[PDB]
Amino acid sequence: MSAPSDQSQETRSPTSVGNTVAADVQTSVHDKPTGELKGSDGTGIHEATGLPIDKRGEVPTVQLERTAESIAKMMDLLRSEKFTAAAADAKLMLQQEFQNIVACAKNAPQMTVNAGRFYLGCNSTTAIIAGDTADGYEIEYSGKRIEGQCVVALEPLTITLSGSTSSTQDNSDSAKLFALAVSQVWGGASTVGIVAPMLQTVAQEQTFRARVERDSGFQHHAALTTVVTTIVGWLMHVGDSAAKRSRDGWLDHQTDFAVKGMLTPHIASGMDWAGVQTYSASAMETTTDRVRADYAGRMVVHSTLRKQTLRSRGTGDTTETENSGRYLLALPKCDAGVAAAALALTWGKPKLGGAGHANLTAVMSEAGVGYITGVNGTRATPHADTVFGREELVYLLGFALRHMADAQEQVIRNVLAQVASLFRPAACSAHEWMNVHGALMPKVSRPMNEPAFREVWNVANSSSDLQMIDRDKLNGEHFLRQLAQQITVNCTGTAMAIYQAVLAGPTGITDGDTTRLQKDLYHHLFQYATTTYADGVQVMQANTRMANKMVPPVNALAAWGLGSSMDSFTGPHCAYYFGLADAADGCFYSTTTGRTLSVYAVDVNHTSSDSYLAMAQLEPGLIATATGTGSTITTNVEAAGVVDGGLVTEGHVSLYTTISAQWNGLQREVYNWLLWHACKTEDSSHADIVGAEEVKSAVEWLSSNSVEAHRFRSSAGLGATEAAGSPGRRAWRLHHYDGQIFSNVIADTERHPYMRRLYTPSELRDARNDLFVVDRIWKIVMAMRAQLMLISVQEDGGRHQHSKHYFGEAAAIGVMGHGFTNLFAYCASTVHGGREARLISNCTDTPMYKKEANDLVPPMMKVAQLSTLLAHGGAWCNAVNMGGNSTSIGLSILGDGTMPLQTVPWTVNEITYLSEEGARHGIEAIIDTNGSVSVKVKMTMLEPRQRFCLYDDNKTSSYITAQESRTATYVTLKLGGTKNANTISGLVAHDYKLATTILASTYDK
Amino acid sequence: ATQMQQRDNGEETLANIKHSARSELKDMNVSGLAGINIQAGGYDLTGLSLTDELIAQGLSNVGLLPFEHSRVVLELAEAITVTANNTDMGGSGQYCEQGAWRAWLHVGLNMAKHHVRIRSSAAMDFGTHRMMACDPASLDASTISAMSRNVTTATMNAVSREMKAMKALAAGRSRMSQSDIADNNDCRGFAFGVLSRMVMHNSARRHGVVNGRLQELGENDASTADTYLTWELACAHGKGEVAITPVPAAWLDPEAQLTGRERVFSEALARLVDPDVGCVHVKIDGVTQNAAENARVHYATRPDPMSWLDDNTGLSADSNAGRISGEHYTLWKGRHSKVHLTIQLKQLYHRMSTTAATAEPRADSIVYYLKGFEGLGACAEFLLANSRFGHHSFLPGVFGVTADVHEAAYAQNQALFLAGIGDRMPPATFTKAQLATATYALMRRYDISERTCHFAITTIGHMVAQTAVRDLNNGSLSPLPFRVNLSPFLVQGVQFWDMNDTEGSVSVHDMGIGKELLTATYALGAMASLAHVCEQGGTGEEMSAIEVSRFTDVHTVATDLFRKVVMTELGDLKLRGSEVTHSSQEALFAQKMKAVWSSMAEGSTRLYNLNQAYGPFVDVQLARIRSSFVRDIGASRQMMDASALIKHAQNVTYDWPQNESGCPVQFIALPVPSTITHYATPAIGTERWFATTRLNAAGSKVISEIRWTNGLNSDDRAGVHVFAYGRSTIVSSPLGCAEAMAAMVIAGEHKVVRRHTSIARAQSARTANIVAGAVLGARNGDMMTIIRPSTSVASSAVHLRGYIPMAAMNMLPITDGDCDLVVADTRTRPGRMSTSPEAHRRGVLASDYHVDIATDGNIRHVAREVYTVADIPTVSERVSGLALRPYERSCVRDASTLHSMLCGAVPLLYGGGEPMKLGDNTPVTNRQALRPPEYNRNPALRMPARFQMGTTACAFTKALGDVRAQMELREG
């Protein structure tokens, strides 16, 4: 930097013949080592009645501030490094109207972690009130209370990694002291004095060097949040928390995985391309995974956790071993139970193949935070079988936060926004669409040894010396709630953004092309998030830490949808935000009798109850108002209808399809090698939606000589010693091959095989291909398999680019799915625990969605709450607008409660109650006249039993933390709040002298 | 002197000079300035690598000395923010966009000719501290009387003899009359030898066969003779026309005058161009010890990069044996396109260590008396050995220079002896054992002065780090030859004198792997050099054109512009010891460096100070020019057909691909005949083919035979072998030239929002939008012309497509007051902010919207290879129109939470076209009638279920028809 350190410049002069004192003992820098402790340990006991003061699930701890002189000394040395100035702290400040809603959802929210998707509901008993007037005297009909529960399922996003954290080393007295330790080893003592215990000698200095890679220093703030992500990911796995298992067993036992779209006894709906590949996988019994639907018809896959993320590691890979450029983090010392958990998180690296949540487990490893338990910093490894169950798994998070972030309490809260951003609202109603969102990942650039710091500062014991206590758990379970509270704010905000695009942006279908429909919705978001930062230049400050592009973060979308101050969500410097990924790939249903959807005339004028009764008695997925094979149907022309686009040709789904026959040479060799795998690999589990470009780019990369593609071909038996290049496999175009097409057994009979072998991603991995290369190539293979399944069934091989695939294209535009409407219904009810809240006023004769005098909510939530209520009673309220359309609220053509978007003024005309227990709620009597229906709500939070919960907090455990520690001194003496800390020596000047030797140059006499 | 007899002050000045000279002499031996204090021990290299303007820019201090996976990316980001007034979707709101463009920088050995001239000089400007005490400052009196009290004779009885023959030997070579060679006292010659050798074995990344195949060796592990170390060569490779860039400019210019070393390095590079080669094994062989007019080259190129070359001999034992094996250094081609050169420890040297101990040196040999290098015999040997031939050494870069410096000192075969190690040693040279003891001890101990050292440190830093940006569409820069001198190895004080055992601050051993020095040397060239490329990017010709005079050609049109070049003024040259003479074509780099970082100029950073004071001059003609080696000449997307320069730039196509900075700007094959200056715009290019004498069946060229014939793209080549085609394109307004990015990220202004009018280059309000329009149309992807009425020479129409940045707004060739922007292809297609390019074209014309840029750019170090995803999120053309003012409308306006209506934003600036049949047209006769309702049928069947835990099955099914048969109806 501009200046050499002050300590380095200072001289012994002026001197004198009488300057006896040794060099070491002047030019010694001024240090006053012990630094006062700065924070207060405990929640506070009430003075009277002696009953401990309560703040829920909370542990607060004390941390060392450092003396003024000592930071100055740390500074003279670190002349030339950059450490981020402090990230700002702001609460989130919301608009007045939204303020009241966010407070209520926040107050108690308790997830119920059923089969792979977070579960919440507010059970609500509501008294429908019918208001109508006779000449100024009011009337009311409220016959019975509907009992119904609004459940808001939160399913995790699809993650892919691109952006890598910039090299600024997050600022800590662990980081500052690491920076010195690297600079001192490398650039020899005299860029700093020996900076740690055990860095004095050499053979201490050499062992620290060999480990710790050169660019290798402190980014815990970024490495912490990605750990938090994966353990929260693992918390959905081994949910019961009475689960006890071996790590291999945990990998092998098959929990449901959270796949894209809803499925019903006689239809499936709105499932991504990944989901549609896996539907065939379940249907044809060819794969080992079965697609299953959680209650309410939701969707789930039944694979082993091993199968999704972790396939393709040859037996070289385990445990994030030393000098692989990975993070290598320090484990605190605890019963094997906890040590086994950290080992299992980043088992032989599992790359991102997304089950809905498979992603979360993957994320820790990809950024490279790969805990180690060997080697001198972190305790002895724990045997293959140590059964970490959800309790030891929570300990790990608990400690991760206490020793990451140095108790800063900005970064730890800042993590929550990124963890909350990973979760959607789920898709239930049978044509949801409306989900064009994926959290894009960063991988930390900077790799440094985890135990290098701890081994070099251990004066006595040779092991990392951070100790787990039973207070880390209190922090773990406290954080779990802090995540559980902030997620409700994020998930609500996201819905609002979706509504903003749905209502206002223009969304239209041409030829019933769903992706192209969805892709537009993604664009609008992508532009309703960029404006949120609110200046050109503040983005650059907010970026500073991250060097992916400025792709704006996913919860920035929630910041716009929500009241919109952007400082709270990802701060001006917010290490590791995840930006936006285009996960919009499709709708695509299918039926018991593969068929298209019948379109039902409903004619608008003359609303009769019986036609509306028949519709309710109809089935939920299959009815679709407008057929868009030829026409572009915007929700201004066609509000509130499903546009059923008919089976999907070869032609839509081109930017998706991965088998094609157009390849030029020695890419013919590569592509034939890819096909041969696809056709043979029994048991492949799909979720990576590889496009035509992914295989295009892979085969181009694979063909051209770079050392990586070169070694691959020499490994896999192509192109080094190959005599049957030219003819053997360049004219082998599939639709030649004999015998079985889905079984590894190749006869010695068979004629026509590509090459007489099959390589699994163990050998290819044991000839040394980056785990990235083998995975992506193996990912393509699996995708080509699935795709082979659809072609077979499909109306043809897409010889014609209008050939009909077996499934659908049906998008529900001008409609909010059950997940979005339940989300509003949950939030709407919490503000209406006591008050009446009249919902629909003048049901006929003005817009359904209206804002008037006292609201407490927008007015989607008012009608959304109304929808969910009429659902659980037995009502089918049809809202019909003069023009041409008709859509219902409560029950629907989709099934269950779905409020329709108002791009066109909706007016109610008739309600049709399914079944008669003749004790109805007065609504039909208010539609003949026109009156207001007030809804007195009483709700009860969906609180499950202890053995399926996100967070359990211990109300009694406040007995432990309250008291404030302290060491009261008897017999006077003076002990201030002062504890010893590290210190460092500094350069000093040493004057050295060689032992005198005589050769035959020197004068001597 | 007589006058100063007679000045009132004159006698004091005399008493004082004499008195200081007389005391200073008495004890030369206790003289050093290295050990004075912790910084100026270890040569004041603590803090150099990161200045403070640059830290701000964010470059990390890991230092950019190639390590297995190091790439430096200069990426700038801007965030344009248009405030749209008459939107096509409801009437107001603004639309922020954000993108980032990434440069690439390379660092490595710089190939342009090294003009190092080595002459023994006798002076104390550098030398050594013991020497400095030894000769009095001004009064010339014999000192041997005094010197003897302090030095044994065996050293000085013997040294003088070495100084006699060495003088005769050089008189041998230049046939100089031997009065006129002088015995050396300068030590820049040494500081350089030991220093160069160190900043090679420590910088480079070494491939040890730790087991089985090649591996890396950790920061701490032995270097066995068999270590391939590959040094990243400031080059880039690719596909598309420019196979390698940037070549030495001058290899290309029509008459070369190249030396023996370049002729077997340029041919080596060219064979490397074929789209299928990996590591061109250049073996050199057979060189006799009278002289070298007979050395067989050979080229075996194996087409993968890692089968780099191998030899059967451990470190050669005496040079004549070392000679026989001959010296072979492979070149291989990269990942990330950094052409890496690889060489083996056995090659750089031959085993001096012929230790002979503690008795008067024998009638003819050099002996180094090393005090307390214990067991560093191997680290020492590597530092001080006659390079393998020990004669004419054919290593491509600095090594060739280092060998030449060594060769000036001793004829082939003067056997060097080491004393103070016991009789033998192994060569292992584990690294610090290299820099701990070896380069630091070696120089501190001999009292060798900061000043000798900053000079070696900057000079090496200069010929191991010329960093030239990676633009492959067009060339880079032609990194210019630098002119420096250095005296041979023998040194009065260092070579035969005792080793001075007392330290002052930091202690010789406690200096680690010399990261301070090594990063410091590497950094200095890159930071200083980067401006020169950056400076070139930043500034160009004012009107966008370069004058051409008659038959011309690009090399020649290169020296004519020089007459009009401008450079900043140096200032305070106190440090360079009157080696300060110019050619008016040599400006030291740090002429430029002051321009970019203006801030460096007051002397507060060694990086500027150290550089300007003692930094090789370079040369500045050829620096405009770019040279790259292209596959063929004459079928290039853009040969602008000579004529446009003749009639005038009727058209110019700038087409910027999806992601990178680069513009494949157009050039005019530039030897095109005419009778007067016709102004070219925008690039002048020249294709040349060189053919080199053919190889014997195996791989023979004799070094002398190697003769290159320039011919041009209109002269016949069936005869004369060819190896590569040279194209050099010179350019004025750096748009779409990789540098533009280099100029922006590093000099360019940052972090303050400034509106299109201020950024734009045009004058009137009216013609400031047209440029702002021309780019914003060009982002989405639909070409946009700015057409000018023919008068002037600006080129009638400039059109650009593809992803342009705003500073690039800055460089578009004027536009004033004649010309309106017209969209070339109007086909309306989905786009990103817009659709139907025209509605836009109208949009700009009305002053509806303005776009205000802010950008921040960071220089970066990337150490772990990273994968990125570029998503263009893009709206449809079918249904961009429709979405008719959702917000004036009073139904929507009423189902939307209030702020939304309040805030300015919009998904689109302008709506599109062409919607397909417009409504849910389903022919009736498709609407079934809902069957009559059944009144009494219980609803448990349809009413929505409520939360119960678990998950249960789906039953569906299909059968897989045989795939193969359908694969038979084909795909897909």
Distances (CA, A) of A616 to A601, A641, B940: 15, 16, 12
Largest distance between two CA atoms of chain A:
133
Give the SS3 label for residue B297: strand
Residues 465-484 of B with CB under 8 A from A: none
Interface with chain B: mutation pick from A160, A510, A894, A992, highest number of B CBs within 10 Å: A992
Minimal Cβ distance to B972: which of A660, A705, A1004: A660
Q: Do B94 and A991 touch (CB under 8 A)?
A: no
CA atoms in the 13 A half-sphere facing the CB of A805: 27
Q: Is residue B33 part of a domain?
A: no
> Is B363 at the interface with chain A, CB within 8 A?
no
Q: Do A734 and B967 touch (CB under 8 A)?
A: yes
Distances (CA, A) of A414 to A96, A408, A438, A486, B742: 24, 11, 19, 10, 35
In this structure, the number of other CB atoms found within 10 A of the CB of residue B142 comes to: 7
Give the SS3 label for residue A743: coil
Q: In whole angstroms, what is the distance from residue B673 CA to residue B633 CA?
A: 19
Using an 8 Å CB-CB cutoff, list chain A residues near B907. 501, 505-506, 523-524, 527-528
Residues B906 and B842 in one domain: yes
Largest distance between two CA atoms of chain B:
137
Q: In whole angstroms, what is the distance from residue B879 CA to residue A638 CA?
A: 13
Residues A268 and A676: beta-carbon distance below 8 Å: no
Angle at B62 between CA B58 and CA B64, to 5 degrees: 90
Cα A624 to chain centroid distance, Å, stands at: 33
Q: In whole angstroms, what is the distance from residue B75 CA to residue A549 CA?
A: 9
Using an 8 Å CB-CB cutoff, list chain B residues near A291. 954
SS (H, E, C) A413-464: HHHHHHHHHCECCCCCCCCCCCCCCEEEEECCCCCCCCCHHHHHHCCCCCCC
Q: Do B967 and A516 touch (CB under 8 A)?
A: no
Q: Do B897 and A858 touch (CB under 8 A)?
A: yes
Residues B451 and B599 in one domain: yes
What type of residue is A299? M
Residue among B819, B818, B836 at smallest CA distance from B827? B836
In this structure, the number of other CB atoms found within 10 A of the CB of residue A648 comes to: 24
Residue among A619, A576, A725, A579 at smallest CA distance from A225? A576
Q: Do B932 and A614 touch (CB under 8 A)?
A: yes
Q: In whole angstroms, what is the distance from residue A874 CA to residue A613 CA?
A: 11
Residues B82 and B216 in one domain: no
Q: Do A847 and B894 touch (CB under 8 A)?
A: yes
Q: Do A990 and B507 touch (CB under 8 A)?
A: yes
Residue among B509, B516, B460 at smallest CA distance from B39? B516
Tell me the helices (H) and strands (E) count for chain B, helix number first: 28, 30
Residues A327 and A450: beta-carbon distance below 8 Å: yes
Q: Do A527 and B220 touch (CB under 8 A)?
A: no
Give me the domain span that covers residue A752.
668-785
Distance from CA of A568 to the nearest CA of B (A): 19
Q: Do B892 and A903 touch (CB under 8 A)?
A: yes
Minimal Cβ distance to A119: which of B891, B928, B947: B947
Using an 8 Å CB-CB cutoff, list chain B residues near A161. 867
* CA-only gyration radius of chain A, Å: 33
Distances (CA, A) of A963 to A43, A47, A52, B808: 7, 12, 9, 65
Burial state string for B574-610 with b = 16 or more CB within 10 A and e = fewer than 16: eeeeeeeeeeeebbbbbbbbbbbbeebbeeebbbbbb
Q: Is residue B48 part of a domain?
A: no
Using an 8 Å CB-CB cutoff, list chain B residues near A1001. 151-152, 154-155, 369, 496-499
- Phi and psi, residue A695, nearest 5°: -75, -40
Q: Is residue B426 part of a domain?
A: yes
**Structure obtained using:** cryo-EM
Q: In whole angstroms, what is the distance from residue B286 CA to residue B294 CA?
A: 7
Sign, CA dihedral B18-B19-B24-B26, equals positive
Q: Do A97 and B898 touch (CB under 8 A)?
A: yes
* CA-only gyration radius of chain B, Å: 35
CA atoms in the 13 A half-sphere facing the CB of B640: 29
Minimal Cβ distance to B498: which of A114, A598, A1001: A1001
- DSSP per-residue string spanning A173-192: TTHHHHHHHHHHHHBPSSSS
Residues B35 and A989: beta-carbon distance below 8 Å: no
Residues B768 and B851: beta-carbon distance below 8 Å: no
Interface with chain A: mutation pick from B754, B869, B884, highest number of A CBs within 10 Å: B869
Distance from CA of B880 to the nearest CA of A (A): 7
Cis peptide before B789 (omega within 30 of 0): no
Q: In whole angstroms, what is the distance from residue B496 CA to residue B153 CA?
A: 11
Distances (CA, A) of B852 to B13, B776, B816, B972: 68, 12, 21, 48
Residues B311 and B192 in one domain: yes
Q: Is residue B200 part of a domain?
A: yes
For residue A390 the two structure tokens come to: 């959800």
Q: Is residue A776 part of a domain?
A: yes
Give the SS3 label for residue B456: helix
Burial state string for B498-511 with b = 16 or more CB within 10 A and e = fewer than 16: bbbbebbbbbbbbb
Residue among B217, B71, B103, B74 at smallest CA distance from B863? B71
Q: Is residue B433 part of a domain?
A: yes
Interface with chain B: mutation pick from A183, A190, A857, highest number of B CBs within 10 Å: A190
Kindly compute the dihedral angle of the four CA atoms of residues A514, A515, A520, A522, in this order, to the nearest 10 degrees: 120
Residues A822 and A897: beta-carbon distance below 8 Å: yes
Residues B200 and B221: beta-carbon distance below 8 Å: no
Give me the domain span that covers residue B277.
129-539+552-569+578-613
What type of residue is B840? H
What type of residue is A236? M
Q: Is residue A728 part of a domain?
A: yes
Look-up: residue for tokens 């320069």? B645
Minimal Cβ distance to A599: which of B75, B922, B953: B922
Q: Do A617 and B895 touch (CB under 8 A)?
A: no
Residues A641 and A813: beta-carbon distance below 8 Å: yes
Sign, CA dihedral A317-A322-A325-A328, equals positive
Secondary structure percentages of chain B, helix, strand, coil, to 5 = 30, 15, 60
Residue among A156, A436, A638 at smallest CA distance from B874? A436
Using an 8 Å CB-CB cutoff, list chain A residues near B44. 4
Give the SS3 label for residue B281: strand
Q: In whole angstroms, what is the distance from residue A702 CA to residue B702 CA?
A: 39
Q: In whole angstroms, what is the distance from residue B622 CA to residue B620 CA?
A: 6
Q: Is residue B413 part of a domain?
A: yes
Residues B524 and B610: beta-carbon distance below 8 Å: yes
Q: What is the DSSP letter of B37?
A: S
Look-up: residue for tokens 């004649």? B818
Q: Do B930 and A284 touch (CB under 8 A)?
A: no
Those residues with Cβ within 8 angstroms of residue A415's Cβ, 6 or more apart along the chain or in another chain: A224, A225, A228
Q: Do A325 and B864 touch (CB under 8 A)?
A: yes
Sign, CA dihedral A179-A180-A181-A184, equals positive
Q: Which residue of A has its CA nearest to B372?
A: A994
Those residues with Cβ within 8 angstroms of residue B449's Cβ, 6 or more apart along the chain or in another chain: B33, B34, B126, B127, B128, B129, B132, B187
Q: Is residue B371 part of a domain?
A: yes
Kindly compute the dihedral angle of the four CA atoms of residues B217, B218, B219, B223, in this order, to the nearest 10 degrees: -30
How many cross-chain Cβ pairs, A to B, lie less than 8 Å apart? 579
Residues B486 and B407 in one domain: yes
Residues B98 and B138 in one domain: no
Q: Do B875 and A523 touch (CB under 8 A)?
A: yes
Distances (CA, A) of A874 to A264, B271, B522, B794: 20, 82, 78, 76
Q: What is the DSSP letter of B924?
A: S
In this structure, the number of other CB atoms found within 10 A of the CB of residue A97 comes to: 16
- DSSP per-residue string spanning A832-873: -SSS----BSSSSSS-SS---SS-SS-SHHHHHHHHHHHHHT
- Number of domains forming the structure of chain A: 1
Residue among A804, A760, A809, A751 at smallest CA distance from A782? A760
Q: Which residue of A has its CA nearest to B35?
A: A991
β-pair partners for B798: B652, B786
Using an 8 Å CB-CB cutoff, list chain A residues near B958. 280, 283-284, 793, 806
> Is B211 at the interface with chain A, CB within 8 A?
no
- DSSP per-residue string spanning B206-258: EEE-SSSS-EE--SS----S--EEEEEES-EE-SSSEEEE---HHHHSSS---
Distance from CA of B691 to the nearest CA of A (A): 27
β-pair partners for B242: B630
Those residues with Cβ within 8 angstroms of residue A410's Cβ, 6 or more apart along the chain or in another chain: A86, A87, A88, A89, A571
Distance from CA of B875 to the nearest CA of A (A): 5
Burial state string for B180-212 with b = 16 or more CB within 10 A and e = fewer than 16: ebbbbbbbbbbbbbbbbbbbbbbbbbbbbeeee
Q: Is residue B861 part of a domain?
A: yes
Q: Do B945 and A295 touch (CB under 8 A)?
A: yes
Those residues with Cβ within 8 angstroms of residue A442's Cβ, 6 or more apart along the chain or in another chain: A161, A162, A163, A164, A165, A222, A367, A546, A548, A576, A577, A578
Q: In whole angstroms, what is the distance from residue A78 CA to residue A72 CA?
A: 10
Tell me the helices (H) and strands (E) count for chain A, helix number first: 29, 19
Residues B188 and B301 in one domain: yes
Cα B539 to chain centroid distance, Å, stands at: 19
- Phi and psi, residue B340, nearest 5°: -110, 140
Minimal Cβ distance to A549: which of B39, B99, B906: B99
Q: In whole angstroms, what is the distance from residue A107 CA to residue B142 CA?
A: 96
Q: Is residue A774 part of a domain?
A: yes
- Number of domains forming the structure of chain B: 2
Q: Which residue of A has its CA nearest to B519?
A: A187
Give the SS3 label for residue A515: helix
Q: Is residue A322 part of a domain?
A: no
Residue among A636, A723, A654, A734 at smallest CA distance from A695? A654
Terminal-to-terminal C-alpha distance of chain A: 50
Distance from CA of B135 to the nearest CA of A (A): 19
Q: Do A661 and B970 touch (CB under 8 A)?
A: yes
Q: In whole angstroms, what is the distance from residue B332 CA to residue B348 CA?
A: 18
Residues B460 and B195: beta-carbon distance below 8 Å: yes
Q: Do B873 and A519 touch (CB under 8 A)?
A: yes
For residue B519 the two structure tokens come to: 């990063």
Minimal Cβ distance to A80: which of B47, B920, B944: B47
Is A657 exposed, middle or buried (CB count within 10 Å of its CB: 0-12, 13-18, 19+)?
buried
Distance from CA of A578 to the nearest CA of B (A): 13
Distance from CA of A46 to the nearest CA of B (A): 41
Give the SS3 label for residue A151: strand
Kindly compute the dihedral angle of the four CA atoms of residues A62, A68, A70, A76, in this order, to the nearest 10 degrees: 130
Q: What length does chain B have?
A: 972
Residue among A190, A187, A286 at smallest CA distance from A685? A286
- DSSP per-residue string spanning A245-308: --HHHHHHS---B--S--EETTEE-S--HHHHHHHHHHHSS-SS--EEEEGGG--EE---HHHH
Cis peptide before A14 (omega within 30 of 0): yes
